[PDB]
mmCIF file with all atom_site columns, C-alpha atoms in Angstrom:
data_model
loop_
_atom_site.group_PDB
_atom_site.id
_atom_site.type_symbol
_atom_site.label_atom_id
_atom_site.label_alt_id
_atom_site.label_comp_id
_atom_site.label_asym_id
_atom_site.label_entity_id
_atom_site.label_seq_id
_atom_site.pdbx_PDB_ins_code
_atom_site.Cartn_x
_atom_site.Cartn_y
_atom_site.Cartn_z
_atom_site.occupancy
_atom_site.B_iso_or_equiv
_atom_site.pdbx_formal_charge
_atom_site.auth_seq_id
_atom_site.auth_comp_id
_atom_site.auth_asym_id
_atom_site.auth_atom_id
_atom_site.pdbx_PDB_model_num
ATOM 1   C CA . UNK A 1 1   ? 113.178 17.689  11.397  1.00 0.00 ? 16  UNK A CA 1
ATOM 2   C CA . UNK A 1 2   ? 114.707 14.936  13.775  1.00 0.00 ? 17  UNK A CA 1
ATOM 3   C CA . UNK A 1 3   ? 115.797 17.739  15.606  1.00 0.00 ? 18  UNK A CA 1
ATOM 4   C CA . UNK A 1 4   ? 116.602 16.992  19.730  1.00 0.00 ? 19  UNK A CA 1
ATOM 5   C CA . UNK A 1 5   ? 119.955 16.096  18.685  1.00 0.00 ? 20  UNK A CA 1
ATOM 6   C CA . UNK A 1 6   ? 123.116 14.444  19.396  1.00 0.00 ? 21  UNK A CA 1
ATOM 7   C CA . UNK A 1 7   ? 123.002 12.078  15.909  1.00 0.00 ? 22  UNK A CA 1
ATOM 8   C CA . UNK A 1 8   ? 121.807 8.773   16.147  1.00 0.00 ? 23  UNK A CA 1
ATOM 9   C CA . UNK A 1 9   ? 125.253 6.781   15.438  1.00 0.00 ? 24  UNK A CA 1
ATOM 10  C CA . UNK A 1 10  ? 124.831 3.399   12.815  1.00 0.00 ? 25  UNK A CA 1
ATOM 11  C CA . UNK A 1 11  ? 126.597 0.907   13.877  1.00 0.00 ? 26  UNK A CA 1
ATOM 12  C CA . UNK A 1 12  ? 129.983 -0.527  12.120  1.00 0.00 ? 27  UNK A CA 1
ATOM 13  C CA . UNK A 1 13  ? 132.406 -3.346  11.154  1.00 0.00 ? 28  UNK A CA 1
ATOM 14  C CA . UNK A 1 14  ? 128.591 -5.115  9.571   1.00 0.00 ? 29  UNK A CA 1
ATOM 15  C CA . UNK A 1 15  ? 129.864 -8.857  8.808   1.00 0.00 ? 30  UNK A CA 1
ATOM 16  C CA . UNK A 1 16  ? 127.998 -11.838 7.212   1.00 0.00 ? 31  UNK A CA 1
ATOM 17  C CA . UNK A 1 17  ? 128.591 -15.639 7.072   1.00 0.00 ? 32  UNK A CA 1
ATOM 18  C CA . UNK A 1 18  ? 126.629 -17.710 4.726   1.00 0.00 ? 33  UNK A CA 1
ATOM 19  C CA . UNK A 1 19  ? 126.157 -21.233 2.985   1.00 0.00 ? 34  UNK A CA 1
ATOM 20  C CA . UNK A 1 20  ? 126.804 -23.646 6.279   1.00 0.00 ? 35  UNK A CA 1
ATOM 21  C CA . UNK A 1 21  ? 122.702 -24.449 5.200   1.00 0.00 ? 36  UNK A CA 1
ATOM 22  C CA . UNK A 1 22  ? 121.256 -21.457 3.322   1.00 0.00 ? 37  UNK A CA 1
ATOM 23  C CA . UNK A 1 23  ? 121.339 -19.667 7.167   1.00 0.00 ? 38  UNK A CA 1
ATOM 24  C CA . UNK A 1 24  ? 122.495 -16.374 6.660   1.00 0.00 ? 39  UNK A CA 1
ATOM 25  C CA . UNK A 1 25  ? 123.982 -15.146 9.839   1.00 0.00 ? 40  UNK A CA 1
ATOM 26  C CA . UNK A 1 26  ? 124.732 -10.775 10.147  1.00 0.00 ? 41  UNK A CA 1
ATOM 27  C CA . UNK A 1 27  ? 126.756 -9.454  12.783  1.00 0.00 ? 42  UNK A CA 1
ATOM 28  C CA . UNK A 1 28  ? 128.090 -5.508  13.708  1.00 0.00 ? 43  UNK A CA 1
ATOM 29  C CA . UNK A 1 29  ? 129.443 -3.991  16.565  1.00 0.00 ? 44  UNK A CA 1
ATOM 30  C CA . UNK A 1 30  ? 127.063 -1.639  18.821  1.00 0.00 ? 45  UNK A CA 1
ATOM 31  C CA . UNK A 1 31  ? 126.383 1.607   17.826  1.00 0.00 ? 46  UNK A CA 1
ATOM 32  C CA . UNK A 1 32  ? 127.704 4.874   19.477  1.00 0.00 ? 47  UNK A CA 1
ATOM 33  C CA . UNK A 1 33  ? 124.396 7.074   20.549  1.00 0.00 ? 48  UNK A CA 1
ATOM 34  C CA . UNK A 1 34  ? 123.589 6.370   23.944  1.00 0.00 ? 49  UNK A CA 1
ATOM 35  C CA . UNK A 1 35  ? 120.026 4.349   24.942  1.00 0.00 ? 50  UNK A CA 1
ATOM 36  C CA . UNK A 1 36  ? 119.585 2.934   21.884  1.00 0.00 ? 51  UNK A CA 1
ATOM 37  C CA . UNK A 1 37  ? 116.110 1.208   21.169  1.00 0.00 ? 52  UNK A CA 1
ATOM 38  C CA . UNK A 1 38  ? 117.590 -1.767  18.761  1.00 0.00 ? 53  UNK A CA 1
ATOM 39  C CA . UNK A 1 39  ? 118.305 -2.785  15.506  1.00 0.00 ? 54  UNK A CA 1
ATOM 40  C CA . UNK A 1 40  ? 116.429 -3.084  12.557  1.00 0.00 ? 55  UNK A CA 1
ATOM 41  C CA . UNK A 1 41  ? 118.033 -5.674  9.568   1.00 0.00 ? 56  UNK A CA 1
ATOM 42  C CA . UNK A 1 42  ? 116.790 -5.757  6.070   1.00 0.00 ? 57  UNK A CA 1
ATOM 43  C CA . UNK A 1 43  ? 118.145 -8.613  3.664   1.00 0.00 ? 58  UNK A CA 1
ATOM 44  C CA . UNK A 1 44  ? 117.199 -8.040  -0.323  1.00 0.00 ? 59  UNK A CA 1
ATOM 45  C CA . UNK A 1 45  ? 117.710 -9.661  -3.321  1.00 0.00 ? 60  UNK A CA 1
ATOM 46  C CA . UNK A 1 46  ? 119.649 -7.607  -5.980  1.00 0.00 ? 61  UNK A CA 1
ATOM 47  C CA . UNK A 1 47  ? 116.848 -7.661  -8.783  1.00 0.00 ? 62  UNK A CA 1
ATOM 48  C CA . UNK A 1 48  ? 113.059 -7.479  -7.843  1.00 0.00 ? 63  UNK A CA 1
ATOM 49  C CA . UNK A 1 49  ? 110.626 -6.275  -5.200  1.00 0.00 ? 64  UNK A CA 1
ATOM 50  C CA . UNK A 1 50  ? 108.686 -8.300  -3.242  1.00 0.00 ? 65  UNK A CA 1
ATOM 51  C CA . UNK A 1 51  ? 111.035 -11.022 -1.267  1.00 0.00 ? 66  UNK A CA 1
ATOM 52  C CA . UNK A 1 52  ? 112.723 -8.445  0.866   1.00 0.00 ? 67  UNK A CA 1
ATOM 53  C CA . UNK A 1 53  ? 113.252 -9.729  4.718   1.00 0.00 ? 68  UNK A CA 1
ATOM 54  C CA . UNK A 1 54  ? 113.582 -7.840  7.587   1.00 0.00 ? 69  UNK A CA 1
ATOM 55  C CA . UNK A 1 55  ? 113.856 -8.918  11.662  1.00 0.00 ? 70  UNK A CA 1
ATOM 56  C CA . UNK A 1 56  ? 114.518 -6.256  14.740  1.00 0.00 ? 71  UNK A CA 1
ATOM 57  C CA . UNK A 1 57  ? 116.403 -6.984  17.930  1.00 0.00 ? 72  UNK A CA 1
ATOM 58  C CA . UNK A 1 58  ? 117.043 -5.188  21.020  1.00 0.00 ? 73  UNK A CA 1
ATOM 59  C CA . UNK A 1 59  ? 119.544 -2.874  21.957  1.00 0.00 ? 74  UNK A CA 1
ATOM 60  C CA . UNK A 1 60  ? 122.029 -5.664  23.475  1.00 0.00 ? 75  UNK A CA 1
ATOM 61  C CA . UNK A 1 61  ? 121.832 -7.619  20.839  1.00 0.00 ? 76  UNK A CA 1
ATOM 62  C CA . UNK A 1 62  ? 124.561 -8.149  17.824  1.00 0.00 ? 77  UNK A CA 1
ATOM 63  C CA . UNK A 1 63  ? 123.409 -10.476 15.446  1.00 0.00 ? 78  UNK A CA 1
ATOM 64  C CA . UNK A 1 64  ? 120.232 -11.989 13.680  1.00 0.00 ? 79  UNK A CA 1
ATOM 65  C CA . UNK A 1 65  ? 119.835 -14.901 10.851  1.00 0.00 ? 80  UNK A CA 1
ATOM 66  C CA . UNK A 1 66  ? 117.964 -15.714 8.334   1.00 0.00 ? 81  UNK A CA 1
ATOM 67  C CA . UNK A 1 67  ? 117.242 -18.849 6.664   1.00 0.00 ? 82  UNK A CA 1
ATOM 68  C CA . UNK A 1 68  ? 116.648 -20.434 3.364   1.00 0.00 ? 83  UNK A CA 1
ATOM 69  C CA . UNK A 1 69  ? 118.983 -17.922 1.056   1.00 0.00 ? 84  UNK A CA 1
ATOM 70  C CA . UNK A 1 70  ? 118.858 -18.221 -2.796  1.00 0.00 ? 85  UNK A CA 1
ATOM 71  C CA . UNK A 1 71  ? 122.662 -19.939 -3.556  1.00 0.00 ? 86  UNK A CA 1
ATOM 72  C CA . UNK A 1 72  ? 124.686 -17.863 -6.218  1.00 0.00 ? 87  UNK A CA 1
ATOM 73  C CA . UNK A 1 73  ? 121.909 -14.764 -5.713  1.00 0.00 ? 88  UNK A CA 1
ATOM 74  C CA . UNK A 1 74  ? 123.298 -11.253 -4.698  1.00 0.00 ? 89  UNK A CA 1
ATOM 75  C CA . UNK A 1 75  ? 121.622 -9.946  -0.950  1.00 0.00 ? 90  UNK A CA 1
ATOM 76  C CA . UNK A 1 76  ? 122.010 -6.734  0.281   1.00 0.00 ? 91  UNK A CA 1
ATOM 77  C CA . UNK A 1 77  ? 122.178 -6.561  3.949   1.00 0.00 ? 92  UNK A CA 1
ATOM 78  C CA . UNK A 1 78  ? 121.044 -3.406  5.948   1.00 0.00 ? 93  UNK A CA 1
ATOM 79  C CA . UNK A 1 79  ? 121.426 -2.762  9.421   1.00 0.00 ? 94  UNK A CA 1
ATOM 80  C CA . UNK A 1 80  ? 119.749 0.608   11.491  1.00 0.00 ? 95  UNK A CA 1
ATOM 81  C CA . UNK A 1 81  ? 120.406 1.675   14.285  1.00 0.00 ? 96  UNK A CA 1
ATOM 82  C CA . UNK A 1 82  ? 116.394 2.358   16.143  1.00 0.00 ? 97  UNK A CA 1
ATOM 83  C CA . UNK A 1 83  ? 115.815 4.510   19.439  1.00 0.00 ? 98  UNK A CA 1
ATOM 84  C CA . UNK A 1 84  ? 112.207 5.046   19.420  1.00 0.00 ? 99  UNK A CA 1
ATOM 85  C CA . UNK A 1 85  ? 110.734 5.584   15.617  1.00 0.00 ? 100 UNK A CA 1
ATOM 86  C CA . UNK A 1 86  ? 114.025 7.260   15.053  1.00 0.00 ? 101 UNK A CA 1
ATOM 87  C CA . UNK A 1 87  ? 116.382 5.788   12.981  1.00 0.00 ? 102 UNK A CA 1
ATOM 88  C CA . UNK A 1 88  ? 120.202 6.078   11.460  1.00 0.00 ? 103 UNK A CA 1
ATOM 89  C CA . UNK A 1 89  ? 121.270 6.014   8.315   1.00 0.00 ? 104 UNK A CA 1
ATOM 90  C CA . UNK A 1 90  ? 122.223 1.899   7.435   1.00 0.00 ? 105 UNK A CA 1
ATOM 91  C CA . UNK A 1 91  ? 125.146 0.526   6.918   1.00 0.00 ? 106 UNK A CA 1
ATOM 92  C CA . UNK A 1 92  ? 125.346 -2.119  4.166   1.00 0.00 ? 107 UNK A CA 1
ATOM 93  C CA . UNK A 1 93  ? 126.845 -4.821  2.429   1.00 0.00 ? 108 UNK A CA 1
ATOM 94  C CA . UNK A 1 94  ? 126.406 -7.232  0.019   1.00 0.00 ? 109 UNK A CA 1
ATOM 95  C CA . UNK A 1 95  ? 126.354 -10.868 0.304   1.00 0.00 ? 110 UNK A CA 1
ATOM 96  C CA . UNK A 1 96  ? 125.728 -14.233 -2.392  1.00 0.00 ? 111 UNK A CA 1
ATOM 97  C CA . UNK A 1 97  ? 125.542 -17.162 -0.900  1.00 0.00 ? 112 UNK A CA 1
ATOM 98  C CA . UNK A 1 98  ? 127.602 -19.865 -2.090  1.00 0.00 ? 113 UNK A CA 1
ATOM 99  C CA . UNK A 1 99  ? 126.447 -22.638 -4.171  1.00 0.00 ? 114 UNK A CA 1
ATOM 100 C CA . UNK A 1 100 ? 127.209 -26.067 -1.866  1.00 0.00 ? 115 UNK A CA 1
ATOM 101 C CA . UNK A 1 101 ? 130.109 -28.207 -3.911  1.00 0.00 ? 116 UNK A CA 1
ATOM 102 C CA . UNK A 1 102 ? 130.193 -31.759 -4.113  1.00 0.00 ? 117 UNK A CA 1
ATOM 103 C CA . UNK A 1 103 ? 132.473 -33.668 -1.389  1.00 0.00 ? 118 UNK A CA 1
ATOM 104 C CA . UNK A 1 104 ? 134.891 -36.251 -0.917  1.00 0.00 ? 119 UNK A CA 1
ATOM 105 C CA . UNK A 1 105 ? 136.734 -36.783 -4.250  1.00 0.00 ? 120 UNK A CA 1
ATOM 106 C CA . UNK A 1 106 ? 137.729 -40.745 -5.145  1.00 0.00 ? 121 UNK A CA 1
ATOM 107 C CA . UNK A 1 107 ? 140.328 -42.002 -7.793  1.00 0.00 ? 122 UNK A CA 1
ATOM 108 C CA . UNK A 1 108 ? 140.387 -45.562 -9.000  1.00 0.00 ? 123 UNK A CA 1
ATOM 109 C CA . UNK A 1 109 ? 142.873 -46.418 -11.614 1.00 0.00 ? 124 UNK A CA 1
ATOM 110 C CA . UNK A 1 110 ? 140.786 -48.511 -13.604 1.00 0.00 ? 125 UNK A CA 1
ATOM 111 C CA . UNK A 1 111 ? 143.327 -48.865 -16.631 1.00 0.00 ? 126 UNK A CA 1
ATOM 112 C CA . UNK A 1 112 ? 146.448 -47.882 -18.018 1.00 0.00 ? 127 UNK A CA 1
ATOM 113 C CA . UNK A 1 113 ? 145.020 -45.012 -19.793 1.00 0.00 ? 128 UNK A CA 1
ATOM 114 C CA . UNK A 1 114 ? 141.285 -44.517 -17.416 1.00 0.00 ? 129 UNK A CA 1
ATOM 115 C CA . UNK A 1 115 ? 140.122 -43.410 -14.463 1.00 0.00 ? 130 UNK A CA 1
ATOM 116 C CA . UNK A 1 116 ? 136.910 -43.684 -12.755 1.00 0.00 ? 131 UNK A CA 1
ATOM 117 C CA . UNK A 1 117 ? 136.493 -39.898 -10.595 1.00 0.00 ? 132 UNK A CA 1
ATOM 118 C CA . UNK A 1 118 ? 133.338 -40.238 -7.186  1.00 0.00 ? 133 UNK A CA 1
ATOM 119 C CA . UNK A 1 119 ? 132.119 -37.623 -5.562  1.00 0.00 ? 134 UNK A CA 1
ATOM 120 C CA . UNK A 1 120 ? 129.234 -37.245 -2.664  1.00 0.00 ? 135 UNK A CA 1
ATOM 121 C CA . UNK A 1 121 ? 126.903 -34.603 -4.431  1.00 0.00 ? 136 UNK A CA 1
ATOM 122 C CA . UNK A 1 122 ? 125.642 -32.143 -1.965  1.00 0.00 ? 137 UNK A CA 1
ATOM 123 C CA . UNK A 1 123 ? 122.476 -32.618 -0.270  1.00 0.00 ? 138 UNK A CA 1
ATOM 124 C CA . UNK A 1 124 ? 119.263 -30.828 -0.835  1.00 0.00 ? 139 UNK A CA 1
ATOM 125 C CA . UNK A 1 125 ? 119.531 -28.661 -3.966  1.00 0.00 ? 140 UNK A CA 1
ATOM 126 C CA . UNK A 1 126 ? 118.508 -29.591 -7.319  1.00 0.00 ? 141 UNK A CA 1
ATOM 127 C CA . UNK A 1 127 ? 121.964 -29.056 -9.236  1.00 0.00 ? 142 UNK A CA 1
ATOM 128 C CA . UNK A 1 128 ? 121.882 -27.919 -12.731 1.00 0.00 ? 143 UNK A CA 1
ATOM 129 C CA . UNK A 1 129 ? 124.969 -30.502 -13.522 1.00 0.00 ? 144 UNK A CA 1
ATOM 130 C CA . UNK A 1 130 ? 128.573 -30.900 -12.589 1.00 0.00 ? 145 UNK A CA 1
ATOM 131 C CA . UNK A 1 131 ? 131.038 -29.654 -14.501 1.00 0.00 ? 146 UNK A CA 1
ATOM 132 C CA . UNK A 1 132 ? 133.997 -31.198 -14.407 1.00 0.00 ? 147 UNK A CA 1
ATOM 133 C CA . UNK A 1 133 ? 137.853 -30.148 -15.529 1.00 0.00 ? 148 UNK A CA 1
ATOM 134 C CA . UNK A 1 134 ? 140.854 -32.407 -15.992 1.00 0.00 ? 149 UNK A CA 1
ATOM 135 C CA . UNK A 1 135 ? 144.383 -31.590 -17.066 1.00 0.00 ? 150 UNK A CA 1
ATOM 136 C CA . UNK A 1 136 ? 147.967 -32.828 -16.874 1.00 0.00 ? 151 UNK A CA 1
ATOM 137 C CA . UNK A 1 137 ? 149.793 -31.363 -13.566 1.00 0.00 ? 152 UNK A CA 1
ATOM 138 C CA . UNK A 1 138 ? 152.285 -29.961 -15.918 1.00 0.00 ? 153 UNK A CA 1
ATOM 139 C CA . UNK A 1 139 ? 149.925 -28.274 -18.545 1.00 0.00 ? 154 UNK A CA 1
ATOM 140 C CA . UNK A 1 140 ? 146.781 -26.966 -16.802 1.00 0.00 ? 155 UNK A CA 1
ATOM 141 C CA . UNK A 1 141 ? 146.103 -25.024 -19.954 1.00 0.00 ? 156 UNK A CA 1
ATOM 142 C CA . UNK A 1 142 ? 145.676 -28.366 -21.799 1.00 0.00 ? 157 UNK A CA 1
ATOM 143 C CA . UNK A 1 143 ? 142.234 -29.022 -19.726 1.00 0.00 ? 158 UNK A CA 1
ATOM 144 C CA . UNK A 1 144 ? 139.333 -30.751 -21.191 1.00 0.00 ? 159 UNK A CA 1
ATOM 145 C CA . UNK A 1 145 ? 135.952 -30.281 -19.613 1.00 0.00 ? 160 UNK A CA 1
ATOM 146 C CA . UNK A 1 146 ? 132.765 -32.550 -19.179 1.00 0.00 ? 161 UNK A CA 1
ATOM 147 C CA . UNK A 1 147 ? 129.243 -31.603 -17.749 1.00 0.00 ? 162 UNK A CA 1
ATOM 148 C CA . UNK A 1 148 ? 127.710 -34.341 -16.152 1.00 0.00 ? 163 UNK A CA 1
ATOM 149 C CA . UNK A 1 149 ? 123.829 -35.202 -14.852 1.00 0.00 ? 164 UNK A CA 1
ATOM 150 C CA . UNK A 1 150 ? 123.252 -33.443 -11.423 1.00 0.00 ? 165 UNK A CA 1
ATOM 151 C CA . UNK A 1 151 ? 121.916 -36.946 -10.431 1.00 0.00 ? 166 UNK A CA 1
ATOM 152 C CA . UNK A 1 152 ? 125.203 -38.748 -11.311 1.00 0.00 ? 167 UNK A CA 1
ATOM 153 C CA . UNK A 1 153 ? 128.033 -38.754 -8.816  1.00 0.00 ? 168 UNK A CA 1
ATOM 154 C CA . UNK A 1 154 ? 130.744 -40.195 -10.984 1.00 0.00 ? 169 UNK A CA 1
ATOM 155 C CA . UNK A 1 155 ? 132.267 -40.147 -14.385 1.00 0.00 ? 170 UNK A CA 1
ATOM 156 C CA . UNK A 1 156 ? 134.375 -42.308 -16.444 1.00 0.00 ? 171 UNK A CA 1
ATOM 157 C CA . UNK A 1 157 ? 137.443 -40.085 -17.877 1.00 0.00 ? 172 UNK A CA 1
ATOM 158 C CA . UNK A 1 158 ? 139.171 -41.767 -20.895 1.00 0.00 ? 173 UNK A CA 1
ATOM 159 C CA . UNK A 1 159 ? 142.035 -41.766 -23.231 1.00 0.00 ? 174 UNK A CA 1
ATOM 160 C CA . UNK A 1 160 ? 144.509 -40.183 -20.483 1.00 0.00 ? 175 UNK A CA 1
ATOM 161 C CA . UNK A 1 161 ? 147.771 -40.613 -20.943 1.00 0.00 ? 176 UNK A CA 1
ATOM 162 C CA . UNK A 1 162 ? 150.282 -43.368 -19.620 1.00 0.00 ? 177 UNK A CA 1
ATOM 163 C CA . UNK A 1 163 ? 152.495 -42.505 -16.578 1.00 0.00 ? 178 UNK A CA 1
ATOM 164 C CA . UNK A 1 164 ? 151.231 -38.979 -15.951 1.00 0.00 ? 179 UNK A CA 1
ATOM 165 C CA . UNK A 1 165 ? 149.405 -37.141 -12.893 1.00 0.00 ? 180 UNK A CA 1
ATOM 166 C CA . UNK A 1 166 ? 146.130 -35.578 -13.743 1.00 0.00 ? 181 UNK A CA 1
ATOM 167 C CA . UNK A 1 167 ? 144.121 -32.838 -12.160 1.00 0.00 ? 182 UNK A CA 1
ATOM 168 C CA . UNK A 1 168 ? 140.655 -33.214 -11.572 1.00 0.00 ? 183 UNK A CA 1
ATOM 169 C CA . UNK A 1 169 ? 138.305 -30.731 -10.024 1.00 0.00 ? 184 UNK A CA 1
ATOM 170 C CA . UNK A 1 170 ? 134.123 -31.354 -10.291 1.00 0.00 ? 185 UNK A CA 1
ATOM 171 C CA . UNK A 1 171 ? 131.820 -28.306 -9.384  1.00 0.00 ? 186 UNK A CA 1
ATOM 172 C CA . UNK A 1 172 ? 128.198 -27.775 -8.562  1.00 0.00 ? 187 UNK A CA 1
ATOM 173 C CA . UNK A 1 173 ? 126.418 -25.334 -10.952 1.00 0.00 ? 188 UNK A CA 1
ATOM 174 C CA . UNK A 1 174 ? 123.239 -24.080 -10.187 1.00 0.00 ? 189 UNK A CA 1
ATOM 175 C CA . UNK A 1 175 ? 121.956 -21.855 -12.650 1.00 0.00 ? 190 UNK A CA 1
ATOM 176 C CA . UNK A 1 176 ? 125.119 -20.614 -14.539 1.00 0.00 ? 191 UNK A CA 1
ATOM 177 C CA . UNK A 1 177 ? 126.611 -20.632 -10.989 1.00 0.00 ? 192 UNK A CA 1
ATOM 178 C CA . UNK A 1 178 ? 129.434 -22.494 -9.592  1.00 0.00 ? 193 UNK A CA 1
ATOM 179 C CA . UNK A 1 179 ? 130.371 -23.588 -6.113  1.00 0.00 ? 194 UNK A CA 1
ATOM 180 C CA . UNK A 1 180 ? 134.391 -23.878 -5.235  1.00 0.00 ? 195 UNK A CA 1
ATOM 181 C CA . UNK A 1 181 ? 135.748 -27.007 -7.001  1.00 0.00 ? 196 UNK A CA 1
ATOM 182 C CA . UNK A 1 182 ? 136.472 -29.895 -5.284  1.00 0.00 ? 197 UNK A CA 1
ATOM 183 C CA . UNK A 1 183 ? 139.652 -31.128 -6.559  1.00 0.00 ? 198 UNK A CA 1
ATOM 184 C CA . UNK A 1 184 ? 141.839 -33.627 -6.596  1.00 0.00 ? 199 UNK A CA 1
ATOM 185 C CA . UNK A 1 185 ? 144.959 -35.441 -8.522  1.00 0.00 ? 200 UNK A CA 1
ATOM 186 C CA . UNK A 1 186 ? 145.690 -38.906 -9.610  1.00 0.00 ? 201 UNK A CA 1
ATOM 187 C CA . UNK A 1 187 ? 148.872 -40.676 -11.363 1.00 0.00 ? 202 UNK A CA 1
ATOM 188 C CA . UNK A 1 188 ? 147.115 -43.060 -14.566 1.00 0.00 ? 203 UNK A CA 1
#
């Protein structure tokens, strides 16, 4: 088959950074066969077939992006080694890009017993809601949960009690999927 041989080497250590704007960034480390052609990159949605991605770049180059990810979807990444129509086997890994959470939490005491919780929602993607979870420091087990309008970017939390410190963390969630939390704690 391939036969003239000395193996064509795939490369290693394959690394990916995400979210930072749906730009997908993949990395490795050179391969080992000597006068190599390039690289050849393959990005794939774990599900159906027809939105698979691929780009190529030269031998003395490490790294190659791609833009406009699905947030909370499963990619898998692919990378071959090419010298001339002759390929390696790919090394792989898997990648879901994180949904974007909401930013800068704000607290304002607003009675004895309520609390008015802010956030700045984050920019261009149509949220499904916020969910948001609140519990005494000392009893996080105690937490009561709200889900709140993707187009609001506060919420009113009631009938806390007097002279304790709360936990409060909102999240994006984007079809069943949920960025980190942003959290924060207040004293009523």
């Amino acid at each position: 088959p391939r036969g003239s041989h000395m193996e064509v080497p795939q490369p290693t250590d394959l690394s990916f950074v995400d979210i930072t704007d749906s730009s997908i960034g993949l990395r490795w480390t050179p391969l080992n066969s000597s006068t190599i052609i390039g690289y050849r990159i393959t990005v794939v949605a774990a599900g159906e077939g027809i939105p698979i991605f691929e780009d190529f770049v030269d031998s003395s180059v490490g790294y190659y992006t791609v833009t406009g990810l699905e947030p909370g979807i499963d990619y898998d990444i692919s990378v071959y080694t090419v010298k001339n129509g002759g390929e390696s086997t790919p090394t792989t890994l898997t990648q879901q890009t994180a949904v974007p959470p909401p930013t800068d939490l704000r607290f304002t005491n607003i009675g004895p017993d309520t609390m008015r919780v802010t956030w700045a929602p984050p920019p261009s993607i149509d949220l499904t809601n916020f969910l948001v979870r609140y519990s005494p420091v000392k009893n996080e087990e105690d937490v009561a949960e709200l889900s709140i309008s993707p187009s609001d970017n506060a919420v009113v939390l009631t009938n806390l009690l007097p002279g304790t410190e709360y936990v409060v963390s909102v999240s994006s969630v984007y079809e069943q999927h949920e960025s980190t939390p942003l959290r924060g704690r207040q004293k009523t």
